[PDB]
Write a protein that binds this ligand. Structure first.
Ligand SMILES: [K+]
Ligand SMILES: [K+]
Ligand SMILES: [Mg+2]
Ligand SMILES: [Mg+2]
Ligand SMILES: [Mg+2]
Ligand SMILES: [Mg+2]
Ligand SMILES: [Mg+2]
Ligand SMILES: [Mg+2]
Ligand SMILES: [Mg+2]
Ligand SMILES: [Mg+2]
Ligand SMILES: [Zn+2]
Ligand SMILES: [Zn+2]
Lengths: 80, 46, 49, 178, 135, 120
RNA sequence: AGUCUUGGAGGUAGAGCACUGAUUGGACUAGGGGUUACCGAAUUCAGUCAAACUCCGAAUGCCAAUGACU
RNA sequence: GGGGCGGUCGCCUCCUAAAAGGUAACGGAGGCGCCCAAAGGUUCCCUCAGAAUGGUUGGAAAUCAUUCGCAGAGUGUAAAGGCACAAGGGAGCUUGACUGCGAGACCUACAAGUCGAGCAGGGACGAAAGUCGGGCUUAGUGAUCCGGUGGUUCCGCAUGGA
RNA sequence: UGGUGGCGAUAGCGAAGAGGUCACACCCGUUCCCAUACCGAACACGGAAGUUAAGCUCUUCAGCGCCGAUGGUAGUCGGGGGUUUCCCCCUGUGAGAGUAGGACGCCGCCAA
RNA sequence: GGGGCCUUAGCUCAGGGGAGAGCGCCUGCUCGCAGGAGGUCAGCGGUUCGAUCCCGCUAGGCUCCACCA
């Protein structure tokens, strides 16, 4: 005879993290980064959605950048 | 001072039983005191 | 416990919005100014009887 | 105010000479007086707070703030946010009026008054005085008092040391225990 | 018998024992010591047997530092059960020892006494060891 | 011993909170206001470059009054900053209240700038 | 598609103790016990350790970009 | 890890998971089937835990006051990732916890799920800039069929109705 | 000197001095606009009696914090070998810690 | 061994806000009365400002299963 485990549960994996590369061209509205909280901040021409999703406001080139000492940001710069 | 919650602060004459009168800020216009600093047995040292 | 409510426009009568309330916390019929699509303006909506 | 004039004309020069201050702005002054009544019996009676607020209004000439519990503590039957005392801050004119009255009228009426402790300084020039009975204040009518209550009077100064603050309060006329 | 007062998790992974010891490779506290030449789990039962062996030989005549602590729990399933149906219950406690780790240190005795004390302890342990000194 | 931070240090904390949202472009520059105990100042700033395009103050010679550092002085500066800005070619601005409450002297400078050309 | 070049996301290996836990010895003691080191929590100095610790942090792999060679 | 018996069945969070993403086991830990009419929106203002020193009740611990104090707190709730130009605390006015939508993305067998600038209508707060399509983020849910209720420039079996 | 930006504390904390006429402060009023769960504390509105004591500005310091190589070592891609809970060798790559050293501000714009 | 249910005073039992009846026992009493005693709320650590109360383990006891070969 054997007992049983009280574990065995997990949630569906949420596919977080970077969705476009540094240097990649993106259209306006392209999701750049999915996250919980602000692991990366919205930089120039980048918005933060209600669930902390970072998205391009313009068409342009994605740039993940250092933001001060500890933090990071992602920006989209117009092609020119 | 907000209107309506503070007692009207007046200059009050404090009259002591020993004849000493001193001006103190008080909500009452006159304060009679049986013992002041000048007649308290503690301060007079007697 | 907490219950579903329907907020009807007091002008035209149209049941424009659903919401919830705690019935212990809000026993009487709740009222909110909300946009009525029929009237095309903010009208006082009231919880349906 | 008599004490405010005394401060400017006599006390501030005397302190400047005694402690050899470089500038008049270093001279210790009374910044504010805070009066406190901890009404931990309010846990039993909400109306006990109203009484204490009224009494402290008469004493201070200024409406006090109702102090609320910042933490729940089972041992005191306290829940966070509960009204548990009253506190007022006297500054400028009313502070000197209250201090003059406290020294000249209220303190002598203390039953078996031995003077105030020389040791109730905080190491940073602030003086704390515990009063056992509110009845020392002539503004308190004896018949209206449902219950005898003490209060804490904190005299906050700009002094950096207890010596400077003790001198300031001595020159103001504070009746220290011999 | 050494064990933690409490642990965060009662059932840990067994882990791996690659590499030399991170720290405690030199005789720090005492004068002499016994250094591991091989990786192993050292149970709290082995530490106690090793401790009593060296301590008894010295005749109250010197101090002992046990440099390893059996922090890691290990589990076992009940006897004669099939695989699965959850992880086994906690059984005992082990220290993870890697090559280079000084296990025990001695002071307040001669080298001759220390060598023999640590020899007697070495026979209680499941690893090859060497006698070491403070540099 | 009371120790207390400077009013400017508390203001700079409030000004940072204003500047989190508000910022000056070349099109719509930032009308900053610093008031002091004695004086009041105004700069129209372009933050992307980091250049004050136009400016005016009570230290300027056109404003000639003994009572500087009052509401009547602030209206005079608000006129001058706006008229100087019109020469540069500035119409739209964003009012940076500078951490101060939008009231009295700071409001009077803003109101005078609105009266005298600038659009905010 | 491969490779080179360039940029980037990420926290593993290792390591470390800055946090959370675990943990060894000394120093020095609140305090509680038999005026006392009688034993002592914190503190402090050194020392260990971690799948669900991280002040750190690779190799690789991954996502791209620009040319080149294929 | 034969079947029975026991346990489990959907959703969320972490670890295992090998530094993108994904990744199994009757592997290791926990939560959910809500709650809030403000615990939402906005404007303005603010800073926390704990300790030291002093205090009538009052004590280790209520309430002051002072200094120190990257957070040693808080964030409705599990956990993780975040958060002190606060996402934490306070106050005023409110109902955007809006209607029509939606370039473009993410996720994905499908069904679903997620993010979204921006446009229009009509608003809230704000001097303005602006922000607001619930809540620091990620659980709090259930296809179709069938039936109920409200609305309706739709159909109505010769025609008008029903 | 004041305002206002940019730059990872190389910008900080701490310590010791120095400087104010104007400017910036503290400061002195509360009559009014406005204000405090109580207070002109703060926020406001007004003033200039005097003070560089504090903030602010300028210098000196490496005590703490921060930045930080080179070399070596751990790990490791790829390729091999062995006595295979692991270990070794080769081309490459290469930390963390420790340390040399750096650093007590660098670059604008406007006004006076 | 696996599920389930219990463990409150000497005894029997009440029960997220600080452990009570009645009995025994004790007191002094003219065989019923007045009043008292009696509690690691089985043990533990943790969730909480609060735990007999929630939560997860650990003994002890009771109940039911422990089958097909
Ligand atoms: K089998
Ligand atoms: K609000
Ligand atoms: Mg997950
Ligand atoms: Mg949301
Ligand atoms: Mg490791
Ligand atoms: Mg079954
Ligand atoms: Mg991987
Ligand atoms: Mg991954
Ligand atoms: Mg069907
Ligand atoms: Mg018909
Ligand atoms: Zn008298
Ligand atoms: Zn309507």
């Amino acid at each position: 005879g054997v007992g049983s485990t009280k574990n065995g549960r997990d949630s569906e994996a949420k596919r977080l993290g970077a969705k476009r590369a540094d240097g990649q061209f993106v259209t306006g509205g392209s999701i750049l980064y999915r996250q919980r909280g602000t692991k990366i901040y919205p930089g120039e021409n980048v918005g933060r959605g209600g669930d902390d999703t970072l998205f391009a406001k313009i068409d342009g080139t994605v740039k993940f950048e250092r933001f001060g000492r500890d933090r990071k940001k992602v920006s989209v710069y117009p092609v020119a | 001072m907000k209107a309506g919650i503070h007692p009207n602060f007046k200059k009050a004459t404090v009259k002591c039983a020993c004849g000493n009168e001193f001006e103190t800020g008080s909500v009452k216009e006159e304060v009679r005191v049986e013992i002041c600093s000048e007649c308290h047995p503690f301060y007079t040292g007697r | 416990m907490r219950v579903n409510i329907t907020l009807a426009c007091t002008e035209c009568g149209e049941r424009n919005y659903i919401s919830k309330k705690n019935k212990r916390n809000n026993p009487d019929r709740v009222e909110f100014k909300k946009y009525c699509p029929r009237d095309k303006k903010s009208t006082l909506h009231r919880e349906t009887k | 105010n008599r004490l405010k004039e005394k401060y400017n004309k006599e006390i501030a020069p005397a302190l400047m000479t005694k402690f050899n201050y470089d500038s008049v702005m270093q001279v210790p002054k009374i910044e504010k007086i805070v009066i406190n009544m901890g009404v931990g019996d309010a846990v039993q009676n909400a109306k006990a707070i109203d009484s204490a607020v009224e009494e402290l209004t008469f004493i201070a000439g200024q409406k006090p703030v109702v102090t609320r519990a910042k933490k729940s503590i089972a041992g005191f039957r306290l829940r966070e946010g509960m009204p548990i005392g009253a506190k007022v801050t006297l500054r400028g004119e009313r502070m000197y009026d209250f201090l003059d009255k406290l020294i000249s009228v209220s303190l002598p009426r203390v039953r078996d008054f031995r003077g105030v402790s020389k040791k109730s300084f905080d190491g940073r020039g602030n003086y704390t005085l515990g009063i056992k009975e509110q009845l020392i204040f002539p503004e308190i009518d004896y018949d209206k008092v449902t219950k005898v209550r003490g209060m804490d009077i904190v005299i906050v100064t700009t002094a950096n040391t207890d010596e400077e603050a003790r001198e300031l309060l001595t020159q103001v006329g504070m009746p220290f225990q011999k | 018998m050494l064990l933690p007062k409490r642990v965060k998790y009662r059932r840990e992974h067994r882990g791996k024992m690659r590499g030399r010891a991170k720290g405690g490779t030199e005789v720090h506290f005492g004068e002499f010591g016994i250094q591991a030449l091989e990786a192993s789990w050292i149970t709290n039962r082995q530490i106690e047997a090793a401790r009593i062996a060296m301590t008894r030989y010295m005749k109250r005549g010197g101090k002992v530092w046990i440099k390893i602590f059996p922090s890691k729990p290990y589990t076992a399933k009940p006897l004669e059960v099939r695989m699965g149906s959850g992880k086994g219950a906690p059984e005992g406690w082990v220290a993870v020892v890697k090559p280079g780790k000084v296990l025990f240190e001695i002071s307040g005795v001669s080298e001759e006494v220390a060598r023999e004390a640590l020899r007697l302890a070495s026979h209680k342990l499941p690893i090859k060891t060497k006698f070491v000194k403070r540099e | 011993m009371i120790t207390k931070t400077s009013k400017n240090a508390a203001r700079l904390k409030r000004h940072a909170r204003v500047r989190a949202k508000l910022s000056g472009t070349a099109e719509r520059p930032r009308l900053n206001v610093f008031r002091s105990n004695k004086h009041i100042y105004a700069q129209i700033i372009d933050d992307v470059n980091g250049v004050t395009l136009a400016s005016a103050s009570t230290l300027d010679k056109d404003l000639n009054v003994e009572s500087t550092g009052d509401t009547s002085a602030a209206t005079k500066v608000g006129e001058l900053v706006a008229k100087r800005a019109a020469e540069k070619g500035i119409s739209d601005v964003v009012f940076d209240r500078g951490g101060y409450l939008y009231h009295g002297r700071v409001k009077a400078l803003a109101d005078a700038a609105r009266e005298a050309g600038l659009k905010f």
